[model samples]
Target: IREDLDNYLNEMGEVTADNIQTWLSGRILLIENAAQNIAINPEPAAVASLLEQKALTSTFMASYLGDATGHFTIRPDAKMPDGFDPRVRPWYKGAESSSTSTLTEPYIDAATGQTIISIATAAKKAGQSVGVVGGDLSLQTLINTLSARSGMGYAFLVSADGKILVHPDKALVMKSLKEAYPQDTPRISSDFSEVTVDGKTRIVNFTPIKGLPSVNWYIGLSVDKDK
Candidate 1:
């Protein structure tokens, strides 16, 4: 039963990685196109229309661009807070410093309290930097997918260093796995192990997400011993 459960959990990790990669690929293309358009015309209206059109057909919570001159534009326009500057944002800086697309670590959005990640890349024209383009992706669908369970057990996602990325309990999000099971540090294999939680022994298995090199994430499963 342990071996079977291990295989099952590993397969779940593979499937989740595939789904997220596919979704991100589509968004990457959209942002790349937006960058191209904005490079040729940096006017606010042009940038707004480009992002608005992409947002209409995208899963992005928002699509945006920030040029070298500190100008920022976003779809579904809203008032900016005092001192808001996209040029200083993480996504913008990540992209501006690299030639390839950058993926951000998952974070909770203060406004909506949803887990979100951003993907970005620098926009260049005539061999000169024009700006950066990026989009915010809500992880609600991915969270739902990771919430699958086995008999009396649940699956979860964690970062390489043990921070819980997704879990059955919403409160556990962003907390370290060690905080829940202090004796156990996360491992990247499906080998079955045991840990005591709330004075009850539970079986656990973990596997690293394959094929995604940008983010070091792992999937895990935990089941009650008697269940």
Candidate 2:
């Protein structure tokens, strides 16, 4: 993403308020906040790019920027929600705070009203800070994919803070795992820990997500007690 951002800047040569969108044609991207000014791919453009199944094939694919002149690009026919600000979003803050690339914890998107995680990096041009560059990954798709392993038992994923990012019970998603299964953690902690979901009990194993030191998340698998 950083390299692509630099490419965008280098390709533009002369940065202006208007040229950013043209430079972003046919790409999925988010530009850094330049003097409280942010640039994004047009929503209509993204939809067109995606419709032909050429543009990453992402659900609700879009771009955004948050700065003094806050702006977000969505379907051309769609209107920018009033008070929409991207700088306040997790992706923008994560990139701005880190010199290296950052991965955000899953969160619900305000714009599309979908769950998403942003892959982002700090932007630089001519040794100066340009802003943060980013792309969105559909958290719902991710969760749905992750939630599919349920033969002997149900599988789920949790964030570092114990929030159930994905679960066999969709209703349990986005809720604290501890809150949802108050009885289950104790079972795991005791000499005999028995966790149950939907009238079924299971034994659980967990591991941390790698290559994302800053993003403390867990991938969990549960085996049916009967199995």
Candidate 3:
């Protein structure tokens, strides 16, 4: 499962300096805080919010950062929270240490109540850092992907710290593994589970993600057991 997710990302999530520039070039922007640091080169994208709407909607595209500490928004009414710094976000910060593009662990996005992770990369021109660039990648589909592996029971992705990143049930998205499966904890091994189901201990398989820094994520699949 981890390999499936990783391979998908490796094939499609890769980002680069030119890619970032090209992608953000056409986005509409409005800046206020840290606006002085902005360098939305060429010129700003067209602002047609009013032209397209009579009512404000809760939709947004991936945001763009102009320079280190710079911020902008596509929606006219949208505002960045105080103390918000893209430079410190996991996407930006993770890309800082990573050589190529990678993902952030699942996190609840405040703007949208959806579980989201980021596809991040550091942008560079001639070895000089421009800034970090990223876009939200919702995890609902990934959760659904894991849920589809419920041939015998269910499948999930758990953070190394024991938090469930993806689960068959949306309500359990960030629950602890121990809390979620306390009855089976004592019999569980690093890569297998002795979850008793229908008078027998069922098996669970675990697969670790390779080469992610400080990321301890594993995919777990098990047979259905009584709660």
Higher-lDDT candidate of 1 and 3: 1
Cα lDDT tens digits, model 2, 112-133, are 6777776665545454554554
Shift of residue 85 alpha carbon in model 3, Å: 2.8
Decoy 1 TM-score against native: 0.80
Residue-by-residue lDDT tens digits, candidate 3, 1-227: 64553443233212221232233222212111112122232133422232123222222234344336554333333455676666656666777787655567777654465678755555555566656544454676566545542333555677767778777677778878677667866222554456664576665655555444346566655653332
The TM-scores, one per candidate, come to: 0.80, 0.64, 0.59
Better of 1 and 2 by lDDT: 1
Cα lDDT tens digits, model 1, 5-84, are 66766676566556555655777777777788878987777778788884533567787888777888777665666677
Least accurate 10 contiguous residues by lDDT in model 1: 184-193
Give the lDDT ranking, best first: 1, 2, 3
